[PDB]
Amino acid sequence: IHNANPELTDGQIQAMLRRWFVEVEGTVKAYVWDNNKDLAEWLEKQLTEEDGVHSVIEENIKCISRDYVLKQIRSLVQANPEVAMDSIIHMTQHISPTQRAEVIRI
Amino acid sequence: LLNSKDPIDRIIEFVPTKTPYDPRWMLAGRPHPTQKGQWLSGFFDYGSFSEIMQPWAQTVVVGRARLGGIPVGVVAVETRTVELSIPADPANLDSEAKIIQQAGQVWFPDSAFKTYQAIKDFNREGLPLMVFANWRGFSGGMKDMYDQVLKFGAYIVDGLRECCQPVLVYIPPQAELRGGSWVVIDSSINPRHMEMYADRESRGSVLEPEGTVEIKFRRKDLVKTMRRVDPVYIHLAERLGTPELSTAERKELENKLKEREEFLIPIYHQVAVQFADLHDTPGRMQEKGVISDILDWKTSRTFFYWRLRRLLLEDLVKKKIHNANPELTDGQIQAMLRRWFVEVEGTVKAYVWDNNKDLAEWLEKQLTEEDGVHSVIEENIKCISRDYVLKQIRSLVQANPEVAMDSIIHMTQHISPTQRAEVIRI
Amino acid sequence: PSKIEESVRSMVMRYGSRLWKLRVLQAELKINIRAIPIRLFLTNESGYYLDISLYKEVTDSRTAQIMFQAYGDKQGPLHGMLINTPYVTKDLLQSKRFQAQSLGTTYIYDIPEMFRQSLIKLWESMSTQAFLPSPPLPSDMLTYTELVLDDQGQLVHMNRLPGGNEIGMVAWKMTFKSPEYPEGRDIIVIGNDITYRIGSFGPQEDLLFLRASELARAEGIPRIYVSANSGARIGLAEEIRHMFHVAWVDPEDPYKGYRYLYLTPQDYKRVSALNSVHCEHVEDEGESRYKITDIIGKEEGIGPENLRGSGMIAGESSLAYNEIITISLVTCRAIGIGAYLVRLGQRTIQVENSHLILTGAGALNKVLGREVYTSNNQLGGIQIMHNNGVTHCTVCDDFEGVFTVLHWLSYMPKSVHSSVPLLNSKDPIDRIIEFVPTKTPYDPRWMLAGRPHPTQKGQWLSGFFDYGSFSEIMQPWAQTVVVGRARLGGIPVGVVAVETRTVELSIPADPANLDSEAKIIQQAGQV
Ligand SMILES: *C(=O)CCCC[C@@H]1SC[C@@H]2NC(=O)N[C@@H]21
């Protein structure tokens, strides 16, 4: 999680894990948190198994990482507009023709 | 920095001698012993020296001072013998108080730990270090080895590796660095900040001359030397080389040779240690590149003032460069500064680099003046910063195309209509 | 024949210590079976491994010459060799191996083999602690490549024969399979060659150390340093030593001093082109003289460049400790810089009868003016280094040292980017602890590891941690606290615990201060 968004603090990270556990397992199973065995097993299943269950927690982490890099991009261009048109070309090269149509349209 | 009333361009009136002396006399100065008034000046600004932790580990002196109005941390070495008094615990009626003699120019566990504390504290305080290094090595006796001298010697290295301020080591006159005491303050530990300078009356090597002759120039080789020097020994040795003189004559010649060669040992021993001393000179260190320069004592104040001023200004501009592009290394940053100096001033003026005064003034003009000359160096730094953030943008989108179209909109909003026309055109 | 092999193996191993002391390295036994002759050939080098080969004499040749034929499995060096091959007169490795063993230390190029054999012991030792897979054959347990310097100063991975080092430093990258990591973990091994210009860090040795440490940091893997050295290299400019003349104050009475040392033109003209000496021309006593002011020396590796280099590598070690695992093994001795290089790793294994010093006993006696010290072990031996917290563990020989290194490595990650290794322990997690701490003083080890059941003769009372997993370090230093490593359910952990019994701290007397006394101080527990 921290590598996905290095600007998070500890409380935020722990909150994300707690919420994800409840959201995936359910609210009735929310009590299964202060149980080291059960929760360790669940975490192991999310961390060790690939190409299969696919580890939903990994998907949430990927969402965080995506949004973080997006925020960095926006932050750099907004803090420094003078470079906006030097990168605008390169990021419109490796795109689908429909995406280019949207760039041209808008 | 202060505008000091002690001139920078003066000389030092106190000269360190070969006999033991108080290290404070060279740091601060002393009352002129001849007269009643008249103060003999030291290295640092008059009245600026303040010692700390004075009675603890008295073989080393640490404190704060000012050089030309520039605050510095100070480390120096006691060359007099001191007496460490250890009290008796009243809870152990079988204990005794003890007095231990501690020689100067030696690192003991206490003095090594004190030096570590000073270094770490001044690194956090934010001051450069001026070290007057005169250690002949570490104590290797049983009791200092038991009391963990090796550990604290390691701590010194770990302290110096984390310096962020200039560290200037100077070997005073009639001072030496030997063996273990060099390898722990060598500039290779922190090459970006550490520098070493030596006086002309300095020495530095692995082993003192006595320790070298005891290994490489033992008695057998001393005799071989005498074979080609002493006229008396030569005459006797040549006479004994004549075939078949007589039994009695050969016996007499052999006894004369034995007496002569034995009689001449102490003098050729002094010669031998002199020879070995010629290997420990600062000329050799300068040729090999382990020191930066050889300085004179009387004018060291001026030199170190202008050098420290240069280094501090360079640190300012280097920090700006690093913030513009944190992915640069040290060689790159220094090269950028060197090239910019030449490019702006011209190639004929390129020699004006190993001149601390001139280059300090140039750097100050680039750093202190705004809305005016406008500081061309700032423009180059801004170029670096712009390109760096541009590279970050390109890197993020190219490493992750899936976000390219989520930011494409926002960066095409706060633009001129012609820029939008170019976006649509493409 | 296999039974004869077993018999001879046991008989040689039990008396291997005596054979070692008598320098018996080769042995041959001729015996007839039933009749077919067989010839047993035994090589017993360094005292951890005994090599036994077996050959039959086969006469099926074209000439009247007879040759050896082995049994296919491990044919060995004498396969197809004539039975009348004479005995040779030592080789590349010998006469350097012999010197190193004559100093009480192992030769450097025998270190890889030790690792292999130690690993075997490791796979055996841990078989009582965890459910391990079948161990691979010894030929697959360790593979290494030697790290050498090129002409530019960079590392080259090279496979060559042992004993081909041109400098006093050797290093390897080793990959090996351990019980905790049976897929391969990497280490970097660095060692001094005691026989090359006795000990003595030069610039090239320093450079190799630096580059190998850099490799370790770049890969994030452990660094193992084997210390057998004599500190920084020194020397004297011999090209001047036989040329100089003394300018005496009184050439007839040399006991009123001399003024300077000088070269004559005949000597100066032969060295001025080398930048070996700096002189200035003077006229004195009606003679043309070149007065010596500085000596540089034409030979590289003896001057102040060794100070820089030493400091350089010291800095490297200080960095390495904060990024990777650093372990140091002391096999012969370390002087000066060598000691610091050990200390900066902060994980020291010290072989019996070795010492870590900064100054030798002879030097101290020369300084102090009397025969204060007799041995260097009085200055840096176990009785000092192991009791003041420098040495973590002591071992009897080099082989046990290698084993201890591997043992420690079994608790920790294979790299700085890996997790802690977990084992499938044979000690159940779900049991209870059979030892209960009492109100009265007790040994902390009893609750950590357990104790023999005092009621019976068998029966171990279990403790907190996995049975047999506890390993204490720095035991005799500051005995009021116990520190070590252990495993909980196969999970390695660091352990801190407190002594509740009273202990006695014995402080020795310094022989250099005749007014000093040894002291015993009672240290209470829980303080
Ligand atoms: C002085 O020339 C060097 C002093 C080195 C330390 C000496 S040697 C014996 C004493 N024991 C000890 O711990 N320090 C003293």
From Swiss-Prot, chain A:
Effect of residue 40 to V: Frequency <0.004; may play a role in breast cancer susceptibility
Signal peptide stretch: none
Superkingdom classification of source: Eukaryota
Location of the protein in the cell: Cytoplasm, Cytosol
Tissue: Expressed in brain, placenta, skeletal muscle, renal, pancreatic and adipose tissues; expressed at low level in pulmonary tissue; not detected in the liver.
Post-translational modification: The biotin cofactor is covalently attached to the central biotinyl-binding domain and is required for the catalytic activity.
This protein's domain notes: Consists of an N-terminal biotin carboxylation/carboxylase (BC) domain that catalyzes the ATP-dependent transient carboxylation of the biotin covalently attached to the central biotinyl-binding/biotin carboxyl carrier (BCC) domain. The C-terminal carboxyl transferase (CT) domain catalyzes the transfer of the carboxyl group from carboxylated biotin to acetyl-CoA to produce malonyl-CoA.
Linked pathology: Acetyl-CoA carboxylase-alpha deficiency: An autosomal recessive inborn error of de novo fatty acid synthesis associated with severe brain damage, persistent myopathy and poor growth.
General function of this protein: Cytosolic enzyme that catalyzes the carboxylation of acetyl-CoA to malonyl-CoA, the first and rate-limiting step of de novo fatty acid biosynthesis. This is a 2 steps reaction starting with the ATP-dependent carboxylation of the biotin carried by the biotin carboxyl carrier (BCC) domain followed by the transfer of the carboxyl group from carboxylated biotin to acetyl-CoA.
Assembly description: Monomer, homodimer, and homotetramer. Can form filamentous polymers. Interacts in its inactive phosphorylated form with the BRCT domains of BRCA1 which prevents ACACA dephosphorylation and inhibits lipid synthesis. Interacts with MID1IP1; interaction with MID1IP1 promotes oligomerization and increases its activity.
This protein's name: Acetyl-CoA carboxylase 1
Organism: Homo sapiens
Gene: ACACA
Range within the parent protein: 2232 to 2337 of 2346
